[PDB]
Amino acid sequence: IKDFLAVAMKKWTAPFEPFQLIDNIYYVGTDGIAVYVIKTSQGLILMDTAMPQSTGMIKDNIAKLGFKVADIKLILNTHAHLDHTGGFAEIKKETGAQLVAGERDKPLLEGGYYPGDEKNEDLAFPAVKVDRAVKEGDRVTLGDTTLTAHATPGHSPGCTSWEMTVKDGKEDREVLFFCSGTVALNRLVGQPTYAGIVDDYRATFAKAKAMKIDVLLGPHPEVYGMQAKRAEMKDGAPNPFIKPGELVTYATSLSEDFDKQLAKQTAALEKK
């Protein structure tokens, strides 16, 4: 946790210039937390926020593109940890937007706590009410734009990956805002962070490998190597964010890391 907090006041708060990523999806996060605006014909969708102390920064980034924070109608969450939820209560109150999140993450959101470590104030965030609790396959529509919820638990109990279609020239491309599949601070064994966590992770890796996704996105830019792609982006060159093999490759890496951490945490149960 100490190192988690160290990273959270370093790459996670460092600037990154907002940009149009593909079609109606805009990057407005930091160098280390990815946040998105999705422009629809009936207002904006905000996909996540960042650390609680970074809300003004995210609002400023939205402005740099000429979007209005006031025009946010829906706030969607990938998963309910403070580095993604820290601005929800504030932006919701300022805008009147509705918050949409995976049903099993509702208790987290509504209590502002880290599951299985509820007394840790360093992982707390301002509590926020969930307006629509989603399940696998639910469709969330604003104007011309529809995202589909995919239940991909593990990193959190209600982790939701959100799929949408965009255009690249005349052709459709499928985008996935992947929710996260890292072990990170979670306990897998002993006193697991929540019941059924291990089966959820391995179900999620399998699910992720079976999806047909052209553009992998996630809640940190390292999920999809954002910075290297942004540097390659040129008017009249293919959009570097289109890499259809990427979610299978990434979920394979996550599964291998999972196995290593499950084995480390299992070895650590043996009390010396």
Give me the least distance between CB of 50 and Zn ion, in Å please: 9
Between vectors from CA 125 to CA 124 and to CA 128, what angle results, nearest 5°? 130
In the complex, least distance from residue 186 CB atom to Zn ion, rounded to whole angstroms: 9
**Interface with Zn ion by CB under 5 A: which residues?**
81, 83, 150
How far apart are CB 272 and Zn ion at their closest, in Å? 30
Annotated binding site for Zn(2+): 59, 79, 81, 83-84, 90, 94, 136, 150, 155, 207, 220
Residue entry with tokens 């907002």: 18
Q: Could you give the dihedral angle defined by the CA atoms of residues 256, 261, 262 and 263, in that order, rounded to the nearest 10 degrees? A: 90
- Give the nearer residue to Zn ion in terms of CB position, either 67 or 178: 178
Compute the Cα dihedral for 92, 29, 50, 139 and give only its sign. Answer: positive
Chain centre distance of CA 55: 16
Q: Is 240 helix (H, G, I), strand (E, B) or coil?
A: coil
Least gap, CB of 89 to Zn ion (angstroms): 18
Please name which of 102, 104, 108, 107 lies closest in space to residue 123, comparing C-alpha atoms: 108
Our measurement of the distance from residue 136's CA atom to the centroid of its chain's CA atoms, rounded to an integer in Å, reads 16
Of the pair 23, 83, the CB lying nearest Zn ion is at 83
Choose between 83 and 103: whose C-beta lies nearer to Zn ion: 83
CB nearer to Zn ion: give 83 or 214: 83
What is the smallest separation between the CB atom of 18 and Zn ion, expressed in angstroms?
A: 19
**In the numeric block, which tokens belong to residue 39?**
């422009």
Q: Which residues contact 123 (CB under 8 A, 6 or more apart)?
A: 1, 81, 82, 113, 114, 117, 185
Q: What stretch of H or E contains 65?
A: none
Identify which of residues 26 and 162 has a Cβ nearer to Zn ion in the complex.
162
